[PDB]
Amino acid sequence: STGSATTTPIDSLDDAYITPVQIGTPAQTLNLDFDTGSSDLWVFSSETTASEVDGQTIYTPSKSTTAKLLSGATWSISYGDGSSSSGDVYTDTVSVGGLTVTGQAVESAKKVSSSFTEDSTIDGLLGLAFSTLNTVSPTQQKTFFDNAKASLDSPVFTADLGYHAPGTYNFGFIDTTAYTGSITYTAVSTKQGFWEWTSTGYAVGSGTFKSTSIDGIADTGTTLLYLPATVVSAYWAQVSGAKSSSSVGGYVFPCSATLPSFTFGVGSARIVIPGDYIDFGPISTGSSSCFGGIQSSAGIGINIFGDVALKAAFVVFNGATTPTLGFASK
Ligand SMILES: NCc1ccc(C(F)(F)F)cc1
Ligand SMILES: NCc1ccc(C(F)(F)F)cc1
C-alpha cells in the first residue's frame, strides 16, 4: 500500500510545515508537524490543560470508537530548542493520505510548553526518526512509519518541501516525476536514533567546493541549517555588513543585501540552496536587520540539515534493513 499527503507552510517564512492526519473513528483531522528528528506522535487533546490551548484542534479519544487507553503508559519529551510536553497514551487508528495504521500509539498531551501553545497552526507532531527515540514508558512504542513498513510497497517515505509553497510527503513509493536527474544515496548511521549522514563538503556562492566531511542529521522538524562555526563564518563573510549578534542569537545581515547560494555535497553530487531560501526576514517588525537561515551548530552539539536545506531537494528516507538517504535536485 502507499500514501500521499500535501504539506503546507504555516507562515510566510516557512517556519514549519503542517500535514493533515486522520485519527480515530470517525476521523478527527488534525494538522501535524512531520518531524524526522523525533519519534513521538503526540497531539493536543481534550486532556490538555485548558490554559495551554490557544486555537489548536484537539483530539478527543472519548469520541473515537477505536481508541484504547494504554494502561500505565506515560510520555515526556524535550526538544533541542527547549520545547517540551507530556501526558498519557492511547492506541487508535491513524491515516495519512490514504495509508492506514491500526493500533498506533497516540500520545495525548496533558501539558505543553509555551512555544507550542503560541503556535495555533500546529496540532501536534508526527515523529519519523527511528523508534529507539520514542519516549513512552515503561513500554517503548513504534513510530507511524515503523508500524506501516510491512504494508508499504517499498519501505520508504519521501519529503518534497516547497519554498513558500505546498509540498508532498509520500509513503511507500518514489515519484520519479518529482525530481530531475538521478537520486544520490548515502549511508545512514542509526546509532543516535537519527537519520544521520555525512555531507562531503560545501561551497559558498560561485566559490570553490571545499571537500570536508560534515556529519549531521536530516531533520524536517528544524527550520534552519545549523553547521560548524568555520563553515558558517565562511558563508557570512561573503555578505556585506553581516555579523553575529549575541542579543539576537545568531547571524543577522542588512535586509538590502543579496545573499549568495550555499552548496552542500552528497557523495559526488551537489545540492544548491538558492540565496533567497536563506533570508528569514526582519528580526522585528520594521527592522532593516534580517535574520539568516544558516547558523552555527556550536551551541547545539550536532549539525542539522533542517528545512532550509531539505526544501532545496527531493529527499528519500529509505527505511530498508540497511537505511539510506537519497537526495535529488528538483
Ligand atoms: N526536530 C527534532 C529535533 C530537535 C532538536 C534536536 C537536537 F537539538 F538534539 F539536535 C534533534 C531533533
Ligand atoms: N523540532 C521539533 C519542534 C518543532 C516545532 C516546535 C515549535 F515550533 F512548536 F516550537 C518545537 C520543536
Catalytic hit among 38, 86, 95, 199: 199
DSSP-derived secondary structure for 143-212: -HHHHHGGGSSSSEEEEE--SSS-EEEEESS--TTSSSS-PEEEE-B-TTSS-EEEEEEEEETTS--EEE
222 lines ligand 1 (CB under 6 A): yes
Residue 327 CA to residue 167 CA, distance in Å, equals 16
Between the CA of 37 and the centroid of ligand 2 the distance, in Å, is 10
Of the candidates 284, 229, 214, the one whose C-alpha atom is nearest the C-alpha of residue 255 is: 284
Cell of residue 187, nine digits: 549511508
Q: What are phi and psi of 146, to 5 degrees?
A: -60, -40
Q: Which atom of ligand 2 is nearest to the CA of 119?
A: 9
Amino acid sitting at position 234 = A
Cell of residue 60, nine digits: 478527543
Beta-bridged to residue 325, according to DSSP, are 186, 317
Q: What are the domain boundaries of the chain?
A: 5-174, 175-330
Between the CA of 172 and the centroid of ligand 1 the distance, in Å, is 25
Edge-to-edge strands, sheet with 289-292: 243-245, 250-254, 289-292, 279-282
DSSP state, 45? B
Q: Which atom of ligand 2 is nearest to the CA of 80?
A: 1
The sign of the CA dihedral 223, 228, 234, 240 is positive
- Do 23 and 32 meet the contact criterion of CB atoms below 8 Å apart? no
Residue closest via CA to ligand 2's atom 4 equals 221
DSSP-derived secondary structure for 255-311: TTSPPPPEEEEETTEEEEE-GGGGEEEESSTT-SEEEESEEE-TTTSSEEE-HHHHT
193 lines ligand 1 (CB under 6 A): no
- Do 44 and 57 meet the contact criterion of CB atoms below 8 Å apart? yes
| Given resolution (angstroms) | 1.8
DSSP-derived secondary structure for 73-109: EEEEEE-TTS-EEEEEEEEEEEEETTEEEEEEEEEEE
Residue 314 CA to residue 311 CA, distance in Å, equals 7
219 is annotated as an active-site residue: no
Between the CA of 83 and the centroid of ligand 2 the distance, in Å, is 7
Residue closest via CA to ligand 2's atom 11 equals 83
Of the candidates 97, 95, 94, the one whose C-alpha atom is nearest the C-alpha of residue 6 is: 97
Q: Which atom of ligand 2 is nearest to the CA of 115?
A: 10
Residue 271 CA to residue 250 CA, distance in Å, equals 24
Edge-to-edge strands, sheet with 269-273: 269-273, 262-266, 196-204, 210-218, 303-305, 225-227, 294-296
Say which experimental method was used. X-ray
33 is annotated as an active-site residue: no
Q: Which residue do the cell numbers 535574520 mark?
A: 291
